[PDB]
Design a protein around this ligand. Sequence first.
Ligand SMILES: Nc1nc2c(ncn2[C@@H]2O[C@H](COP(=O)(O)OP(=O)(O)OP(=O)(O)O)[C@@H](O)[C@H]2O)c(=O)[nH]1
Ligand SMILES: Nc1nc2c(ncn2[C@@H]2O[C@H](COP(=O)(O)OP(=O)(O)O)[C@@H](O)[C@H]2O)c(=O)[nH]1
Ligand SMILES: Nc1nc2c(ncn2[C@@H]2O[C@H](COP(=O)(O)OP(=O)(O)O)[C@@H](O)[C@H]2O)c(=O)[nH]1
Ligand SMILES: [Mg+2]
Lengths: 426, 426, 49, 50, 436
Amino acid sequence: MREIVHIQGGQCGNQIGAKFWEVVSDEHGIDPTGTYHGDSDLQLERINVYFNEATGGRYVPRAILMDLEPGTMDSVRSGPYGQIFRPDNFVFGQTGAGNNWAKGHYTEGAELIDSVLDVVRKEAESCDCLQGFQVCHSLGGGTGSGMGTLLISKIREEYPDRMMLTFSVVPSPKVSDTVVEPYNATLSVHQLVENADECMVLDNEALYDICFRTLKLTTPTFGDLNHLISAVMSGITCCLRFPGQLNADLRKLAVNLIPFPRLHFFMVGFTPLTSRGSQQYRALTVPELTQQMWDAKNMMCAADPRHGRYLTASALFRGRMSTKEVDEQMLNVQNKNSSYFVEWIPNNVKSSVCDIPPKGLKMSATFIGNSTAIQEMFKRVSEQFTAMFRRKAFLHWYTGEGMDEMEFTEAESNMNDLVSEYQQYQ
Amino acid sequence: MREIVHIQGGQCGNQIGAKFWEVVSDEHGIDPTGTYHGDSDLQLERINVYFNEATGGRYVPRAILMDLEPGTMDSVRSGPYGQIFRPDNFVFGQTGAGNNWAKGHYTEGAELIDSVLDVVRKEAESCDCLQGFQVCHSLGGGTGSGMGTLLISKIREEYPDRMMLTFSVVPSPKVSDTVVEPYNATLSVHQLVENADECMVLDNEALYDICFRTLKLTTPTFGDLNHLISAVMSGITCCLRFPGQLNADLRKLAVNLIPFPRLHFFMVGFTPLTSRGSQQYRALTVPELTQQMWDAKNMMCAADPRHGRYLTASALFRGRMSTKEVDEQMLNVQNKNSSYFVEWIPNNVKSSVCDIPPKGLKMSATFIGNSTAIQEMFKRVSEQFTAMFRRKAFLHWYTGEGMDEMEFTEAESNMNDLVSEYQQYQ
Amino acid sequence: MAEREMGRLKKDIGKMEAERQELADKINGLQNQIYKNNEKLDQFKMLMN
Amino acid sequence: ARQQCEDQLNQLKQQLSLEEGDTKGERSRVEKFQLEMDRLGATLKQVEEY
Amino acid sequence: REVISIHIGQAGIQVGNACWELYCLEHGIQPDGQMPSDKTIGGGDDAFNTFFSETGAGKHVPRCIFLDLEPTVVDEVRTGTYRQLFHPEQLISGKEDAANNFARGHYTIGKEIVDLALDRIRKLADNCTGLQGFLVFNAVGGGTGSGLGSLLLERLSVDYGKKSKLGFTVYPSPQVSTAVVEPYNSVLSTHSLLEHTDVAVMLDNEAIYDICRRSLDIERPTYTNLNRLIAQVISSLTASLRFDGALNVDITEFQTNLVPYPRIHFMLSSYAPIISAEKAYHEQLSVAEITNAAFEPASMMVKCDPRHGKYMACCLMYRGDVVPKDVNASVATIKTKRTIQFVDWCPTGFKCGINYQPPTVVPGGDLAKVQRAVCMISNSTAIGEIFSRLDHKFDLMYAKRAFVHWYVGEGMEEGEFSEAREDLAALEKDFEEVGA
Ligand SMILES: Nc1nc2c(ncn2[C@@H]2O[C@H](COP(=O)(O)OP(=O)(O)OP(=O)(O)O)[C@@H](O)[C@H]2O)c(=O)[nH]1
Ligand SMILES: Nc1nc2c(ncn2[C@@H]2O[C@H](COP(=O)(O)OP(=O)(O)O)[C@@H](O)[C@H]2O)c(=O)[nH]1
Ligand SMILES: Nc1nc2c(ncn2[C@@H]2O[C@H](COP(=O)(O)OP(=O)(O)O)[C@@H](O)[C@H]2O)c(=O)[nH]1
Ligand SMILES: [Mg+2]
């Protein structure tokens, strides 16, 4: 009865969501032909949260794709577990944004959003007890950020009190594959400050560092990063789909983590994230899970938690474990580190448990922290934006598209006041 | 007991009727050789509403074909389901109308209507308990419009108390098939409005758009437009032929849809309509059928159903449904947008339920709206008539065969005051 | 060429002038109906009190 | 003659563009007013039920 | 649904030579009169009945009369590749030519041959049941097309009247013309061409030379080349009565749809795609671009810019595989185009007839094999320019009374010279006011 409408913006969001739907279909035990081929009944009492039924037992995701190039949709169609998608959601343009955020927020929005909003409205009135939306995107590009941001604002204006999760991968200095990252990132986070209700920040720098350190892989392609993000995505929503001994729904997680309205940027991790070789040598206990949690070499964001203070933390465990062990481990960590955890919120950590573990594994645990160290990414993006905008570099591609130095200065000022609030509370 | 007489005037009417008899023959399970191979025994019970069973099992339909060129008969008798018509039902002439309403109504009608009435009277007196007449024709033609409405007047003068259904395909703004359509359209509508009991108005642009937007076809031809119109007609004539929880025959439909004697011009629609590749992705669920019915992109007219108000509406469902369900959405759709329905009529909509879904489906629905937004097509035709008659264009082709200009002036006045009386109900 | 263009442009401007007048009448009607409906809502508010 | 012809053609063109932009604005206002109409209708229905 | 055709002069009978060179192969008739016993191309026994009428066992005779006064060309037709096809009496040949003298062809010589031609026209309409109308092929740019052509035209009009008359008249060219005295015969024939012929189709020599030089790239075309595509256009406009299409319009519809006023029947003509044998395939051919080429003034059979005029009505005859949707899609873009402008006295101006039969290629021809074709025939006001320039040509010859004696000494007084020019002027001013 609880509802999470999935939306995938841009190529990065589309591929990440495709892997995520593969993961969720695998978890619920349904073939890529749409039918059900699982064993346990417990996979079937909560399919309605992430799958609409069709005639004949064919389950189809409640997902909507959005981009401007047919090639991404072609790739998603060609890939496995791609046919399950309803072809009534493959909405797209024919020109491509060109990473011109002004173009993707002012010049293709007017021709694609009037349809994508209709599709999302239909999918949101399909079911009754809406909890919210899950939008997967990149705050670096043109059409993954412009259209995604305007669409998030539209859903904000249409559903005033439904929760939006924005799973946003943020560009990094060492993974800057395009030259115009800051002009789009600043302008996107500008509006994501007002619009969304929780934004989880991801970055390819920390993703590659994890794939080189924890997994110690040799050739980590985009597929494995998408798999990591998808596993986190499917592990953060276990309480809605599966029974637990201490549940944790969306608004509970929010109201626990965010103290003040503007402070809704999170860093997320995952345990156990272990290499194939060294996995066979390790037995999995709750202290092991929490060590691999808190260790900074496991955060999926390139933000170092021991460079600041934890506002709040949250741990979603999955496995038939013991609540006394969970609570004592969390408080053990809190007593070990008495400065990295904020002074005026007693026991700022929140913990919850679910029964069914991810397939294959026996125990798992996702981690969401509202650390204040995340200001470093924002201040670095602001520094790069000021460096590029101090001489109007690349600016004409947006100035002739509709925006102005007034809006750019406004975005920079909003970033400055965001890091100001973070430093003030730290 | 009850009986229906089909009439086909014009080339468009003949093709539409051929497709209609194809559909009805498939539905009752008679093969194109005139014999019977249906399985169930709920079909022979009402098989006599259309087919006069002859000695030898040759169930021949009760439809009469009329036109001024044997080419249409060649086509109909050659095409599939052609060897079941009657040789007597092939009355014709060998001159041709050539789009001139004067030739249609005076030059050739005055000597072919005797032949058409002979067969019509023979069939009407061979069928005991008549229910009505229904004719499929083209308003922009010369044989289906002129001679058509001439026969309409003749038969209405003959039988007063038997109702008339006219499936009339009207001119179009975008697909301008002919040059002198507005003259024929005005001269046929001016005759019809007195003798029209129910007038299902159709047009080809609103069907091309359906086939290119909803059904998502590549080559939408007449072999598809006539199929859609046939589906709608069979949906109209379902309560007579089949049992159900809540019957509604032609008289019930007319009484529920005509609130004033000069308000009879229905916009039709059929649901469900799905793309061939997405058939098995959405469930034929009664709500889904309802918001497919109450749609603008699923009408069969150039007029915008949201560009005015609905006076009355009727919905004939077919299949195994639940009346509580059906009526709950019938009331919800009327409570939602209260500005599109007439304020001074509670219960704007009727919802009849049959109990045999059509072959190849699980359930279906046919919509018939007597809305006041239908006046826009009449306004377009009337302003075209002003633009032409302002210079007596093509006037000699009429005035040289038995016409005066008084008919033209009175037709202008009639169209003007009819659109005025539609307007003043708003 | 020039006379063709002016003929086409005159026809277009006449058609779109007519559409503009229709839009003006639509706006006037909508304003009147919103006035009536808001007055009715005020009456209903007082009745609720 | 032809240069005068084209000059008047151009000034008609600019006037038509002006009026076309005006009608676009009018259409936007009409859509907003339809929104307001339907919202007030819904609120009135809720109050009547109350 | 049968139609008979008459061919007068030399241009008429050569155009008819091309037409009956094409119809025989299109219906599969071997060029001697009998269908082949072994192979059966196409089908439909009634399909060929419009132009060929069966006789006896297996010989099919045409429905045309080739009448001319000079025997030099009728004898060539008699002895050529078509000897057993035609009928020995349907080839009427006098003794002496009209010699470009319109008066001589109208009064002296023509008076003793028009009745003989009528004696066979009547006996040919006797054995035809569903007669549709008459089709005349002639060039008024001489003495037999103008004189005898007119004489036969009005003598048929007074006798039948009800049956329509489709003419394909080859007027004198803008500049590239043969005879020196055309500006007399042209007006002398138009005076009786206004109010007698029903639907006239204007043809030019120069424009079709231009088409053959820019489309088939034959830098030195000839009368055979021109008459071949003329016959192709005739077949593409008469295909409706013979081959069954979804939206098919015969002679009566073509007439009642394109003539808004009594005497405004003066049309253009175009055909698409005229493409060489080598470029039959390298160009993408489809409805959109063939229709686009059907309107370009460089692809018009009469050398006059349609941009000078305002269209009143148009008809488009489609051949072969043409779904009736992209035709409307194309005419929508035609309406949205800017160069071509209609008249406000008509809001809907297209009649898009369609037939399911691809065009035929004559053996060893200049036209390639295409899966489809378009024949465009439209009324327009730009023909007033043609009549005005021809009026200017007539005035100079008349003010000096040149060449007049060759007429007045053969039977025509100055009154006809005066009144034909007056009525052509009335035609031109009527076109002015209608375009107004
Ligand atoms: N397109 C085309 N034009 C032709 C053809 N034959 C002749 N013409 C032109 O049409 C005109 C008709 O020829 P005429 O001079 O009238 O010869 P005629 O028609 O036999 O009349 P007389 O010989 O004078 O009795 C000529 O001036 C040529 O310019 C032809 O085969 N095709
Ligand atoms: N995880 C993942 N990241 C990607 C992929 N492709 C690109 N990226 C990164 O994420 C960002 C995506 O930008 P992009 O989607 O192309 O912008 P858009 O075209 O406006 O949607 C880029 O800056 C890349 O560095 C992918 O397939 N997977
Ligand atoms: N939708 C549809 N329209 C048709 C069909 N056949 C003909 N028409 C239209 O009907 C019009 C002519 O009407 P017609 O039946 O020929 O009347 P007639 O000329 O007197 O024979 C044409 O403009 C066609 O566009 C058909 O099968 N389906
Ligand atoms: Mg000669």
